[PDB]
């Protein structure tokens, strides 16, 4: 149980909830100067699945924020409603959008209380948050099931996160990262990590966050808009095989 | 009578209270030194990861204008304790217009931690806190709080991985001589943090408070100067004079 | 039978309540002595580092201007019960406009031990004060059992200290002599050099309030040892 | 590659190889068992209906050696046939884990039943090397009777009973081995689905 | 063996062993004796000290001007039940302006102590009481048990080594009725003395007496007020 | 055993065992044609005494939403009531009939309420929720975990794998509501251990006109491999 | 220093050393195991068609000794190869603790399966030193047939059946040993990640 | 005084003694074991390529005696070295209690390894008293082979197989002993500071 | 009466009767244990650096019988001293109960160490009755060497090996015994208070 320490000062339910995320789909984020994006993989791959929704794993929380999740999905549907309530409570209280760190603190204060108060299970969900505010600009955060958030410039959660992290360490070009550069890196990291090869456009989900005339924008790239990103990858690594 | 419940043992112990201190013996080292008009604490850094914004890894956290705080242990319990102390720092100016003193809020935090060792269905806060600050009469203060709800006052202390080795350092070194000026009160903390550090200087973060100033976190342009001065004063004395 | 306070042994015993008693011997030792001139309290502090300010180790405290307490055991239990005693002594003043007796403070503080909070209090207390009935010394136990005592020792070396008090005590003593006897007993149950920071000492006389001794007054009795 | 090695193993010993043994057991092995049993009875009757003299120590009847060698062959064939099933099951015991071991218990149960069939029955009442036992125990008395010769009459009957009790032992060990084989057949044919794929992941409540 | 760790559990023989174990906690306290004439009711106890240089534990308690108890068992249960009795008597004087009968108090005590025997999460009261009182029906002596049962008695002793006092009282019951107060107190003291070793004897320090009657509120005599009642006891040999 | 407990692998075991109670219930088919949705299931009795016109595995929630299940009927009758209440709450606030996706969300919330406390077991049912909103058909699949999936066709219960491969090989768009019923009955005929009668199954369809449970006459009509 | 010693030992016995053994076992060790069974079966079928007289006690046959020496060499090499893996796994068992002992359980489980290989099959049915037991059993009969010899027929048949039974023992032990090598391979290849780093430093929720 | 005896005990044998043992184990003992394995494998290769006759029963090989004597001296020294560590740990097992026994478990667990290093690993395959066994087993054969000597040839080859199997035994025992020594080194270097002070008072929440 | 018997039995065996044993063990017994190992090493070095013939079989050495007799006299006194502690603890086991048995556990824990010492480690590697075990073996070898005088050389070497292995055995047993005595000293000195008065009933929470 979660209200019990180990002799070595450990909390093993909090570690098992964190081990319950590698079973979930891979989701990464990439920060840039022009914007910030997310990239999830759709393990819901089947000939009879419909895909009615706008997006299955990218959830919009505010006019200036979205999130992606990995882990237990019921827990995600709980936390995504709580996030949307926190944002609107801040708006009602101040009539200004909530910054992209107060929301993460507010959700992590909920996640911390489940590791501490008797008969309830820690949320087996990690999250990534992308958003804009008038204090620090474009941001990217990463929550854990223990109630620990951290700011990042590029991170990955879920299956094969430790490999995408090593790739981003070896290909991120801080200070010179546009949004086309970030998507070109995403299509690479998400192809050198997926078990199913060739990276079908049906098997991914991408969202970009940008600004236009003092308004925030959160779009979702369509199928044909991602086919181009894929086609401009095998060409790129076919040229890195020409020089034999 | 054994582990897994806060009941008792035949010896008269509560092992779930010791196993929480064992979590405070697992975080990063955090020291604190009390002077006359300067008070300095420093905390080891958390091994940055080449793609992380360190604006959010704040180990040192102010509670009011006169009081400050540094913690070791679980990172998330710290945030709740610090917010619940920040609230009381203002509720205390509501209940009586006077500001708060260091012992008041240390006592409050210790009572909050004590409250979580009383019931099952509640887990103790797995942190300690070095709570340094000022007062009216300008009396510098330093306290240390453990998960069990115990608080003392110290001239200098340490918490985390390596506190058992920094306590010997400050035993051998802390006198009235090393608190002559502010620059000697800071060099002591630098040398103490060196005893567990990466032999660097970029893995250090120090803050200070004066009777006049508010909290002032240092930049590496001064940490490097202090560390170079300390490396020079040790190349001359320990080596070139013995 | 050992774990849980709602479980009787076949012989009708509550082992958790006894293990709460055993938590007192893990605390340093304290001594209280009656005298018709007043009461004394004398304790060891057990400083673990020269860096800690020993004045932040509250092992003797004021409950009121006519009652002082000395404790041994868990710090948290002591904080709780000392706050209880302080609050009760002033509710009594508010209602009746008089000073609560030491017997009634002890009676009211022992009633919390009669509440299974889910755990017995791991702390014993000595209450020294002056009442209409003169100087009085009482002793409270985790079982909520309280009794008047002429001299009592609690804590780690309570057995040897009690086995000495039974010889050096008589019902004719003075306060300066009992203070000397207490520190002589305290000298013999310490592997540390007795000094004016390793101990506290307090007294409560009839015509004088609670008074914790100072370094000067302490050294001026350590010298005659 | 590592998975290549695991694949080379799991392709050499497949479910078809383990079922080919069960078919042969249910068809021919049991009838061979019963044939050896009736042969052992046919022989035991002869010794029960006979008088022995000093001449019978000068020669061993090949009628008994034939049944003992048939039981020898049967034991060898069944041992190899069962080690094939063991090898099929044991190259599929998956990653060690605290939990999700509802099919691992099935594998251990069937492996325990097969281990029983091997050790508790084949000797690897009487087991595989009964022929060595018979020839040693008889070669003792054949020397004690010839030299010179021993006048002990009970020894001459003890020779006869050495000849008889081994046929009886065969008749009982075959009867027991039939039961063991019939039990392994049911165990396999009921539990074979979780001997191959013991673990089955349900990731429906993950995203 | 393994129907013992809870009070809500029966055994296959139809017994609850936690209650039987709570009854064994009365045998750990010092001995008390209770007895009554037709005019007065008496409780005599034997007090016990923890350290020799301390005061003796108080064994008899005042509940009202016509009821009083002597306790053997756990101190905390006694301190809770006494505070229950006191408020139940004040509640009767407030409403009716009459003293509460003793039968109607011990019935309430039983109704109170019956709950921990049946619901889990509470401990049975490990204290036995001898209750002496006087009402419109004469004197009364009541025994109360950790089993939530209670008895009306001519006399009784409870606590450690109380069978000796009980054996004494059982063969002098025919005298207690027409005894005056001095003789009744002396019978109580002798029954109490029968619980001691031959080494020890009764003393001012270790004897408390409680008396209630028609023209006498419940008084307690502890240290030097006892010496009238001790004068008269034959110095027994062994 | 316990539900507020993770395994070291990071699995919730009682949920996995509640899905095993869904995997042993009667089969249920679901197909989403272009102009409708079909729901079909096996309603077979243990004797000629059971009156089949008294209980229903196909139930309406509104004029335009309907249900089937695989698993436990006692658990089904709770979620039917809850869905019928939630639809009416939505109507009371907005005076518009509830969309088929919001009901699935609010019902998976109810199924998730029973996954987080001790002293409660999850539901032993999965649902298939058909609808017709905004000129488009919908079909979802709610699970005891609190998770839902939108399908074009699927099958739950006994033999839910071969019954799904049959749909993968024998289902496409450019169908209509009558070509899909034949396919659903053919997908139920795989597991039917006996002669399929009008009373051994139960069918419900949704379209522009709304949800309707077909009658035994209409079932006997298409049971002849007709349409 | 002490960490110097632990590093010098853990750099002398690596996962590479324990995987080289595994791939050698999968490649060639098994092939030699079946070859020994081929030879043993052929020899058993040869001696089975024979008629032993007194000349066969005057000289030992060479084929049997060759097969047994081959088996002995195999068992020696496999013992050493298994002890290499034991060393690798055993110099990495971590600090003793009351919790986080899952990878330690994996380590002990694989070490139990190494014991099952070098305690029950190598004899460190029959194992390494069968070539000594064979010659002992042969000499005990040969001295009894040769000199004032003996005249028992069961003695000659016991000689013959000793020669047959030892080859059968070799044949069965080879099968039983293949079955265990093939299982050690699977266990290693499925659990090597936890046999090397059984505890993962996970202090993300600490400062 | 009684606490003076405790200190006179713990002053004689300290942690530095055990570390001194461990260092020489890691340095020279694990190089001297491989030397004996080498010298035994060479002798096995010698006798394996030999052909024995009556001349070899009239003399023992002077090489095997030296190899076995080396192994015996090594076993003796390792036994005494292990018992020094056993003493260092055993004179520090603290007051018996039912709680705070997490380091007492470390003590008792390292003692398991130290006793495993002796029970079936030094004989205090083969162990310390091996040379007497060799000489007895060989004398039993030379007596029969010399005399009117025995005429069995399988006995004449059993002589050779005796002289070979003991070198093989040494070769295996050396490998197993090296494994166990490395295991003890790892266990000690990981667990020593709770082997010395298994209990630490925590009276910080007491006055 | 009965209490008279209990107290007359307990005053005869007091805590002083055990502390005196502990004192003598810490003082002189360990030095005697060291001196026996010294002399055994001397005699072992003597036997190694010598060659044997027929003349050794005609009389035994005066050097080894002394060492063995001294070890015997040691073990006798150690047994008779351990039994005093055993009695002191065993006549103070309190009346049986299902609770309040935390000192009874200490009693039964130290009696287990005493049982590991006296009944087993003294043999009441080698024990007290080792001199007879030496003489019987050496007589078995001597009667074969003297007779027909066996001309086997391995027998004459086995003589020399018997004369050395027993000195080795004593040398090892003395080390092990010193370890166990040093363990028992600590076990007594850290627990003698609950070994005497295991139950204390100053019950203050009863009125």
Short mmCIF file of N, CA, C and O in Angstrom, two decimals, chain E residues 26-96:
data_model
loop_
_atom_site.label_atom_id
_atom_site.label_comp_id
_atom_site.label_asym_id
_atom_site.label_seq_id
_atom_site.Cartn_x
_atom_site.Cartn_y
_atom_site.Cartn_z
N UNK E 26 -9.56 -8.29 36.31
CA UNK E 26 -10.01 -7.95 37.65
C UNK E 26 -9.11 -8.63 38.68
O UNK E 26 -8.88 -8.09 39.77
N UNK E 27 -8.58 -9.81 38.35
CA UNK E 27 -7.70 -10.55 39.23
C UNK E 27 -6.32 -9.91 39.37
O UNK E 27 -5.52 -10.39 40.18
N UNK E 28 -6.03 -8.86 38.61
CA UNK E 28 -4.74 -8.18 38.68
C UNK E 28 -4.75 -7.01 39.64
O UNK E 28 -3.67 -6.55 40.05
N UNK E 29 -5.93 -6.50 40.02
CA UNK E 29 -6.02 -5.42 40.96
C UNK E 29 -6.04 -5.91 42.39
O UNK E 29 -6.25 -7.09 42.68
N UNK E 30 -5.82 -4.98 43.32
CA UNK E 30 -5.84 -5.32 44.73
C UNK E 30 -7.25 -5.70 45.16
O UNK E 30 -8.24 -5.42 44.47
N UNK E 31 -7.34 -6.34 46.32
CA UNK E 31 -8.60 -6.91 46.78
C UNK E 31 -9.47 -5.86 47.44
O UNK E 31 -8.98 -4.97 48.14
N UNK E 32 -10.77 -5.97 47.21
CA UNK E 32 -11.79 -5.14 47.85
C UNK E 32 -12.86 -6.05 48.42
O UNK E 32 -13.05 -7.17 47.95
N UNK E 33 -13.53 -5.57 49.46
CA UNK E 33 -14.61 -6.30 50.12
C UNK E 33 -15.80 -5.37 50.28
O UNK E 33 -15.65 -4.17 50.51
N UNK E 34 -16.99 -5.94 50.14
CA UNK E 34 -18.23 -5.23 50.34
C UNK E 34 -19.21 -6.05 51.14
O UNK E 34 -19.28 -7.27 51.00
N UNK E 35 -19.97 -5.38 52.01
CA UNK E 35 -20.91 -6.07 52.89
C UNK E 35 -21.91 -5.05 53.41
O UNK E 35 -21.66 -3.84 53.39
N UNK E 36 -23.05 -5.55 53.87
CA UNK E 36 -24.15 -4.71 54.30
C UNK E 36 -24.87 -5.31 55.49
O UNK E 36 -25.03 -6.53 55.58
N UNK E 37 -25.29 -4.45 56.40
CA UNK E 37 -26.26 -4.76 57.43
C UNK E 37 -27.64 -4.33 56.93
O UNK E 37 -27.81 -3.99 55.75
N UNK E 38 -28.64 -4.36 57.81
CA UNK E 38 -29.95 -3.85 57.45
C UNK E 38 -30.02 -2.32 57.49
O UNK E 38 -30.98 -1.75 56.96
N UNK E 39 -29.03 -1.66 58.09
CA UNK E 39 -28.99 -0.20 58.18
C UNK E 39 -27.86 0.45 57.39
O UNK E 39 -28.04 1.60 56.97
N UNK E 40 -26.73 -0.23 57.18
CA UNK E 40 -25.55 0.38 56.59
C UNK E 40 -24.92 -0.56 55.58
O UNK E 40 -25.12 -1.77 55.63
N UNK E 41 -24.15 0.03 54.67
CA UNK E 41 -23.39 -0.68 53.66
C UNK E 41 -21.94 -0.21 53.72
O UNK E 41 -21.68 0.99 53.83
N UNK E 42 -21.01 -1.16 53.65
CA UNK E 42 -19.60 -0.90 53.91
C UNK E 42 -18.77 -1.41 52.75
O UNK E 42 -19.04 -2.49 52.20
N UNK E 43 -17.77 -0.62 52.36
CA UNK E 43 -16.71 -1.05 51.47
C UNK E 43 -15.37 -0.80 52.15
O UNK E 43 -15.11 0.31 52.62
N UNK E 44 -14.55 -1.84 52.23
CA UNK E 44 -13.17 -1.73 52.69
C UNK E 44 -12.27 -2.25 51.59
O UNK E 44 -12.54 -3.29 50.98
N UNK E 45 -11.20 -1.51 51.32
CA UNK E 45 -10.23 -1.84 50.29
C UNK E 45 -8.85 -1.97 50.93
O UNK E 45 -8.65 -1.62 52.09
N UNK E 46 -7.92 -2.49 50.14
CA UNK E 46 -6.51 -2.53 50.51
C UNK E 46 -5.73 -1.83 49.41
O UNK E 46 -5.66 -2.32 48.28
N UNK E 47 -5.15 -0.69 49.75
CA UNK E 47 -4.47 0.13 48.77
C UNK E 47 -3.06 -0.40 48.53
O UNK E 47 -2.49 -1.11 49.36
N UNK E 48 -2.50 -0.03 47.38
CA UNK E 48 -1.23 -0.55 46.91
C UNK E 48 -0.42 0.61 46.36
O UNK E 48 -0.97 1.48 45.67
N UNK E 49 0.87 0.63 46.67
CA UNK E 49 1.78 1.69 46.25
C UNK E 49 2.73 1.17 45.18
O UNK E 49 3.16 0.01 45.22
N UNK E 50 3.07 2.04 44.22
CA UNK E 50 3.98 1.65 43.15
C UNK E 50 5.42 1.65 43.64
O UNK E 50 6.08 0.60 43.67
N UNK E 51 5.92 2.82 44.01
CA UNK E 51 7.19 2.95 44.72
C UNK E 51 6.91 3.14 46.20
O UNK E 51 5.86 3.66 46.59
N UNK E 52 7.85 2.69 47.03
CA UNK E 52 7.67 2.77 48.48
C UNK E 52 7.57 4.22 48.94
O UNK E 52 6.87 4.51 49.92
N UNK E 53 8.24 5.14 48.25
CA UNK E 53 8.29 6.54 48.63
C UNK E 53 7.21 7.38 47.97
O UNK E 53 7.38 8.60 47.83
N UNK E 54 6.10 6.77 47.56
CA UNK E 54 4.98 7.45 46.92
C UNK E 54 3.73 7.24 47.76
O UNK E 54 3.75 6.58 48.80
N UNK E 55 2.62 7.80 47.28
CA UNK E 55 1.33 7.64 47.94
C UNK E 55 0.62 6.40 47.39
O UNK E 55 0.88 5.95 46.28
N UNK E 56 -0.28 5.86 48.21
CA UNK E 56 -1.01 4.67 47.83
C UNK E 56 -2.12 5.01 46.85
O UNK E 56 -2.73 6.08 46.91
N UNK E 57 -2.38 4.09 45.92
CA UNK E 57 -3.42 4.31 44.94
C UNK E 57 -4.78 4.33 45.61
O UNK E 57 -5.08 3.51 46.49
N UNK E 58 -5.62 5.27 45.19
CA UNK E 58 -6.95 5.44 45.78
C UNK E 58 -7.90 4.42 45.16
O UNK E 58 -7.96 4.29 43.93
N UNK E 59 -8.62 3.71 46.02
CA UNK E 59 -9.42 2.55 45.63
C UNK E 59 -10.91 2.79 45.68
O UNK E 59 -11.66 2.07 45.01
N UNK E 60 -11.36 3.77 46.46
CA UNK E 60 -12.78 4.04 46.67
C UNK E 60 -13.08 5.44 46.17
O UNK E 60 -12.29 6.37 46.38
N UNK E 61 -14.23 5.59 45.51
CA UNK E 61 -14.60 6.81 44.81
C UNK E 61 -15.99 7.24 45.21
O UNK E 61 -16.88 6.42 45.44
N UNK E 62 -16.18 8.56 45.30
CA UNK E 62 -17.47 9.14 45.60
C UNK E 62 -18.22 9.40 44.30
O UNK E 62 -17.66 10.00 43.37
N UNK E 63 -19.46 8.94 44.24
CA UNK E 63 -20.31 9.09 43.06
C UNK E 63 -21.46 10.05 43.33
O UNK E 63 -21.81 10.86 42.47
N UNK E 64 -22.06 9.97 44.52
CA UNK E 64 -23.09 10.90 44.95
C UNK E 64 -23.18 10.78 46.46
O UNK E 64 -22.39 10.08 47.10
N UNK E 65 -24.16 11.47 47.05
CA UNK E 65 -24.33 11.44 48.50
C UNK E 65 -24.91 10.14 49.02
O UNK E 65 -25.08 10.01 50.23
N UNK E 66 -25.23 9.17 48.14
CA UNK E 66 -25.82 7.91 48.56
C UNK E 66 -25.27 6.71 47.80
O UNK E 66 -25.81 5.61 47.97
N UNK E 67 -24.25 6.87 46.97
CA UNK E 67 -23.67 5.78 46.18
C UNK E 67 -22.16 5.96 46.17
O UNK E 67 -21.65 7.08 46.10
N UNK E 68 -21.44 4.84 46.24
CA UNK E 68 -20.00 4.85 46.12
C UNK E 68 -19.50 3.49 45.69
O UNK E 68 -20.17 2.48 45.90
N UNK E 69 -18.31 3.49 45.09
CA UNK E 69 -17.77 2.30 44.44
C UNK E 69 -16.36 2.03 44.93
O UNK E 69 -15.64 2.92 45.38
N UNK E 70 -15.97 0.75 44.84
CA UNK E 70 -14.60 0.31 45.01
C UNK E 70 -14.24 -0.53 43.80
O UNK E 70 -15.04 -1.35 43.34
N UNK E 71 -13.03 -0.33 43.28
CA UNK E 71 -12.67 -0.75 41.93
C UNK E 71 -11.52 -1.74 41.99
O UNK E 71 -10.61 -1.62 42.82
N UNK E 72 -11.56 -2.72 41.08
CA UNK E 72 -10.47 -3.67 40.87
C UNK E 72 -10.38 -3.93 39.38
O UNK E 72 -11.33 -4.45 38.78
N UNK E 73 -9.27 -3.57 38.78
CA UNK E 73 -9.05 -3.76 37.36
C UNK E 73 -8.25 -2.61 36.79
O UNK E 73 -7.37 -2.06 37.45
N UNK E 74 -8.57 -2.26 35.55
CA UNK E 74 -7.92 -1.15 34.88
C UNK E 74 -8.42 0.18 35.43
O UNK E 74 -9.62 0.37 35.66
N UNK E 75 -7.49 1.12 35.62
CA UNK E 75 -7.83 2.42 36.18
C UNK E 75 -8.67 3.24 35.21
O UNK E 75 -9.60 3.94 35.64
N UNK E 76 -8.36 3.17 33.92
CA UNK E 76 -9.00 4.05 32.95
C UNK E 76 -10.48 3.74 32.80
O UNK E 76 -11.32 4.65 32.75
N UNK E 77 -10.83 2.46 32.70
CA UNK E 77 -12.23 2.06 32.64
C UNK E 77 -12.99 2.52 33.88
O UNK E 77 -14.14 2.96 33.78
N UNK E 78 -12.36 2.44 35.05
CA UNK E 78 -12.99 2.91 36.27
C UNK E 78 -13.23 4.41 36.24
O UNK E 78 -14.30 4.88 36.64
N UNK E 79 -12.24 5.18 35.78
CA UNK E 79 -12.38 6.62 35.68
C UNK E 79 -13.42 7.04 34.65
O UNK E 79 -14.04 8.09 34.82
N UNK E 80 -13.63 6.24 33.61
CA UNK E 80 -14.70 6.54 32.65
C UNK E 80 -16.07 6.21 33.23
O UNK E 80 -17.00 7.01 33.13
N UNK E 81 -16.20 5.04 33.85
CA UNK E 81 -17.50 4.63 34.37
C UNK E 81 -17.93 5.48 35.56
O UNK E 81 -19.12 5.74 35.73
N UNK E 82 -16.99 5.93 36.39
CA UNK E 82 -17.35 6.81 37.50
C UNK E 82 -17.92 8.12 36.99
O UNK E 82 -18.91 8.63 37.52
N UNK E 83 -17.30 8.69 35.95
CA UNK E 83 -17.80 9.91 35.35
C UNK E 83 -19.12 9.70 34.63
O UNK E 83 -19.91 10.64 34.51
N UNK E 84 -19.38 8.48 34.15
CA UNK E 84 -20.70 8.15 33.64
C UNK E 84 -21.74 8.14 34.76
O UNK E 84 -22.82 8.74 34.62
N UNK E 85 -21.43 7.48 35.88
CA UNK E 85 -22.35 7.39 37.00
C UNK E 85 -22.70 8.76 37.55
O UNK E 85 -23.86 9.06 37.86
N UNK E 86 -21.68 9.60 37.73
CA UNK E 86 -21.88 10.92 38.33
C UNK E 86 -22.84 11.76 37.50
O UNK E 86 -23.75 12.39 38.05
N UNK E 87 -22.68 11.75 36.18
CA UNK E 87 -23.59 12.50 35.33
C UNK E 87 -24.97 11.86 35.28
O UNK E 87 -25.97 12.57 35.21
N UNK E 88 -25.05 10.53 35.34
CA UNK E 88 -26.37 9.90 35.37
C UNK E 88 -27.13 10.20 36.65
O UNK E 88 -28.36 10.21 36.63
N UNK E 89 -26.42 10.44 37.75
CA UNK E 89 -27.07 10.83 39.00
C UNK E 89 -27.44 12.31 39.02
O UNK E 89 -28.52 12.67 39.52
N UNK E 90 -26.57 13.17 38.49
CA UNK E 90 -26.91 14.58 38.36
C UNK E 90 -28.11 14.76 37.44
O UNK E 90 -28.96 15.62 37.70
N UNK E 91 -28.18 13.99 36.35
CA UNK E 91 -29.31 14.05 35.45
C UNK E 91 -30.61 13.65 36.13
O UNK E 91 -31.68 14.13 35.74
N UNK E 92 -30.55 12.78 37.13
CA UNK E 92 -31.75 12.39 37.86
C UNK E 92 -32.16 13.44 38.88
O UNK E 92 -33.35 13.73 39.03
N UNK E 93 -31.19 14.03 39.59
CA UNK E 93 -31.53 15.11 40.50
C UNK E 93 -32.05 16.34 39.77
O UNK E 93 -32.92 17.05 40.29
N UNK E 94 -31.54 16.61 38.57
CA UNK E 94 -32.00 17.77 37.81
C UNK E 94 -33.47 17.62 37.42
O UNK E 94 -34.27 18.54 37.61
N UNK E 95 -33.84 16.46 36.88
CA UNK E 95 -35.20 16.26 36.40
C UNK E 95 -36.16 16.04 37.56
O UNK E 95 -37.14 16.77 37.72
N UNK E 96 -35.89 15.03 38.40
CA UNK E 96 -36.85 14.58 39.39
C UNK E 96 -36.60 15.12 40.79
O UNK E 96 -37.51 15.05 41.63
#
